[PDB]
Every structure is written in C-alpha cells, then in structure tokens.
C-alpha cells in the first residue's frame, strides 16, 4: 500500500548550473565546427 | 496442518533432493598431503 | 481581486463560441480556472478547468469532445470556447477561480482543488 | 458523474427563523463539499468550503456540518439578504457535480 | 493472467493510470493449494 498520497517521482537540477555547462559544451564544440555555425540540441528519437 | 493432514517439514523451508540409492554412506579413511615446498 | 468576463452575447447554430475572463489583481499560476454553465431556470453546471503553473486542462463528460479551455500568463487571461453550439447550449457562462492546496510538486498537479472561492459577474450567452 | 440531491427542494420560512438545509451524495465525500448562494441575475458567493471551513468574509451567522453522505448547512438567523437558492457542490471526485438547489421563501 | 483495476481511480495528478492493482492466484508451499494475492504494479511492466 502506499502509507499517504501517490506522488510522481522526479528529479531536479539547477537550472543556472546546466544552462552554464552547455554554454561551456557548445563553446568547446564549435572548435571541430567552426565559429559560424549553429548548434542545437534536441531530444532523444525512437527506441523504448 | 489443521485422518489428519500433515506436510513435510522440509516444506517450511527446502526442498529436498533425494540421495542416491547406490552411494554409500560408510566412512573412508581421507589422508591430507602437503603440496611441494611444504 | 476582480475576474471580468467577454465574449460574443451569441453565436449562430454550429458556431464556435469563444469566452475570455480577465484576471485583475492576481495571477493565474498561482490558483486554478473553472468554467461554469447555467442555463436559464436551471442549476450550475460545470464545463471544465484548467491549472495554473501546470498548464494541465479537464472537461466534463458531458459536452463530449468540442470543450476547449486555455490560459495566457503572459496577459494573466484565460479563455472558453465550445465549437459546433446548438440551441440547448445557450446559457449564463462564469469564470471562476479556484485555490490549490499543495502537497507534492505543482507542476506535476500534486495538489487539491475544486473549491470555487471566487465568480465572474457573469456573461448570458 | 456523482449524484446530489437536497433536501427540502423549497423551505417555508420568515425573517429571523432557524433554518437546516441538507445535502445527500450518492458516496461517501470525504467531507469535500462546497456550500454557495445564489440570487437571481447574479453569480453565485461562497459560504462554506471542505463541508464545514467558513469562507472569509461571510457573516458568522452561517455554520454547517457533515460527514460520509449527509451534510447540513444551518442559519441561525434568516435575515432578508438571506433568501436565496443554495447549491452543494461535489469536488470529492471528477467531473464535478451541482445539486437541484434549495430555494428559501 | 492479472486481473488489474487503476490503484487510484480519484487521483487528478501524474501518477493516474501508472499504478495498477492486479489480482492473481500464485502458488502456495504446497503444490495443491492456490492462494489469491494482491499487489500494486507500474503501468511499465504490465501490458493488456
Ligand atoms: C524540486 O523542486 C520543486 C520546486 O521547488 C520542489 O517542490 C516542492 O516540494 C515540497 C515537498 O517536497 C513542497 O512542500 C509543500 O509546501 C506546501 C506549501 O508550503 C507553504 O506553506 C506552508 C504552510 O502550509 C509553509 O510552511 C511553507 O514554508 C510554504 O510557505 C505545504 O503545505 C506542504 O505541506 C505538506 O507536507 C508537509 C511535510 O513537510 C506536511 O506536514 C503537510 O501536512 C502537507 O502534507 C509541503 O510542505 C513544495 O510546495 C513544492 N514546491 C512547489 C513549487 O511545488 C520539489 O520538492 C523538489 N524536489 C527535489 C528532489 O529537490
Ligand atoms: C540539491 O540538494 C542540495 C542539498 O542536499 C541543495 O543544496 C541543492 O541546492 C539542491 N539542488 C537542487 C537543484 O534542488
Ligand atoms: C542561458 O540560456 C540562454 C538561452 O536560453 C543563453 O542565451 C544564455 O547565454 C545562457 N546563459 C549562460 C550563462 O550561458
Ligand atoms: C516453520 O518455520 C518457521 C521459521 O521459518 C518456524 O518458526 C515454524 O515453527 C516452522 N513450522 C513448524 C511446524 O515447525
Ligand atoms: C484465481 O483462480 C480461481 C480459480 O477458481 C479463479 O476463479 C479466479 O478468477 C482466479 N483469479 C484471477 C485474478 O484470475
């Protein structure tokens, strides 16, 4: 049984802190890149 | 349980493999030997 | 707090009728939105809700399908709109708001509602 | 779709008297029952909210109890702003329910 | 087979649906006896 309210599982993290790192990620992936293009990130596809 | 009904006691926590009938059960003597450099 | 409601007074058999309700000294994150009906001579009938900070939106059975409900933070207004509307839907349309009891994550809809603590003056459609 | 229904449909009453208003739910509520007036031509007010947590601003004159089916809504003092149809709302479960109303007289 | 019901059918959150209660026999210590057991499963690892 569930001794209280049924609750979703979850899991946070800092928003300021991950919008940092992937400026960082981005800042150093543009270097196999170049200087003039656009980075994007996405979501996974398919699979379960 | 509770001609009464009865189980096994093995039934609580085992399950019980039956001995072979043709492996005796009667004592031999086993010597220990120290390997070489002992 | 004031709610303030608009809307076409009526629309024609198989119209869409589109209603707004505006939120004037509040914010819709923090409460949620009901849509109430009342034919005339009749009791109150719910038509549906939609969250705040959750986005999240339910209908009634009754009024199958057809029911949209949607909210604007951005102008802290919501809106109603019934597509395909017959003669037996004309009725007095109220906006309400709700409060939100919280007891897990809000964005998840961990919370109790369906208390109506505040109406709209009301708009007879 | 949960079922309600009130209890008298319409009450005989003068200024002043004591008057009881009862609500029956088809199953057990959880005490999350919601009381309101409503005067013709306007919304309907809050009274009462949880089945007994009076709403703030409403005069202390209004009171109300209940539990599993059976609610009450008492007015020790039916004052002439008071004679008005009251509805029990239903927000124990989903779609979320009115009764026929009590009209007072 | 399972036999399954939602666990909460009031619940207006996430979590609706995900958390079945299933019904099935499962054997007992004695071979000749069936007992009937009910317990909560996630929607992830029951399929109708
Ligand atoms: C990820 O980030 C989200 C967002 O910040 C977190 O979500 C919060 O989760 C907590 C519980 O984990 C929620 O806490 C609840 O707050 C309610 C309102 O709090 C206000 O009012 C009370 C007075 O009632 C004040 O004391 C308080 O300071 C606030 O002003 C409470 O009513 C809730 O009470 C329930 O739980 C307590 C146990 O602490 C019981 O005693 C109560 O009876 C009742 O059952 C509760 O305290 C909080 O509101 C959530 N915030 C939002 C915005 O949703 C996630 O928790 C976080 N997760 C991780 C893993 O970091
Ligand atoms: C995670 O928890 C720590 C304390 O254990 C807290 O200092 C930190 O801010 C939390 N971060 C998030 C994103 O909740
Ligand atoms: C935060 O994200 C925005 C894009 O949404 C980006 O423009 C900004 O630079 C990010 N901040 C940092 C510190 O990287
Ligand atoms: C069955 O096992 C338990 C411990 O697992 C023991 O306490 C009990 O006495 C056992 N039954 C019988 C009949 O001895
Ligand atoms: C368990 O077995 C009995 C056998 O009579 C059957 O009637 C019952 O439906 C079974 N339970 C489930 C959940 O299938």
Not at chain 3, 41 to 47: F, P
Not at chain 4, 6 to 21: E, F, M, N
Request: charged share 15%.
């Amino acid at each position: 049984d569930v001794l209280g309210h049924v609750r979703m599982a979850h899991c946070n993290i800092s928003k300021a802190t991950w919008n940092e790192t992937l400026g960082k990620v981005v800042k150093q992936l543009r270097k196999h890149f170049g200087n003039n293009t656009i980075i994007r990130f996405a979501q996974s596809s398919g699979g379960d | 349980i509770n001609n009464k009904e009865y189980r096994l006691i093995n039934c609580n926590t085992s399950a019980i493999t039956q001995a072979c009938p043709k492996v005796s059960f009667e004592p031999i003597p086993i010597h220990y030997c120290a390997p070489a450099g002992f | 707090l004031q709610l303030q409601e608009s809307g076409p007074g009526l629309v024609k058999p198989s119209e869409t009728l589109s209603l707004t309700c505006a939120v004037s000294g509040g914010s819709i994150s923090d409460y949620c939105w009901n849509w109430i009906r009342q034919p005339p001579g009749k009791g109150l009938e719910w038509i549906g809700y939609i969250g705040g900070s959750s986005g999240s939106t339910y209908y009634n059975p009754s009024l199958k399908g057809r029911v949209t409900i949607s909210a604007d933070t951005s102008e802290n207004r919501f809106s109603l709109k019934l597509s395909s509307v017959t003669a037996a839907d004309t009725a007095v349309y109220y906006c309400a708001r709700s409060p939100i009891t919280v007891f897990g994550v809000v964005i998840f809809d961990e919370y109790t509602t369906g208390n109506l603590d505040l109406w709209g003056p009301g708009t007879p459609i | 779709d949960i079922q309600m229904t009130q209890s008298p449909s319409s009450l005989s009453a003068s200024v002043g008297d004591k008057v009881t208003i009862t609500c029956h739910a088809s199953q057990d509520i959880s005490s999350w029952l919601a009381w309101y007036q409503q005067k013709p031509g306007k919304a309907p007010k809050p009274l009462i909210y949880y089945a007994s947590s009076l709403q703030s601003g409403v005069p202390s004159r209004f009171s109300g109890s209940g539990s599993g089916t059976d609610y009450t809504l008492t007015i020790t003092s039916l004052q002439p702003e008071d004679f008005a149809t009251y509805y029990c709302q239903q927000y124990d479960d989903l779609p979320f329910t009115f009764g026929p109303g009590t009209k007072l007289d | 087979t399972l036999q399954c019901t939602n666990y909460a059918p009031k619940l207006r959150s996430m979590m609706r649906g995900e958390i079945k209660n299933c019904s099935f026999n499962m054997t007992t210590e004695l071979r000749d006896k069936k007992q009937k057991v009910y317990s909560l499963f996630y929607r992830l690892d029951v399929v109708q």
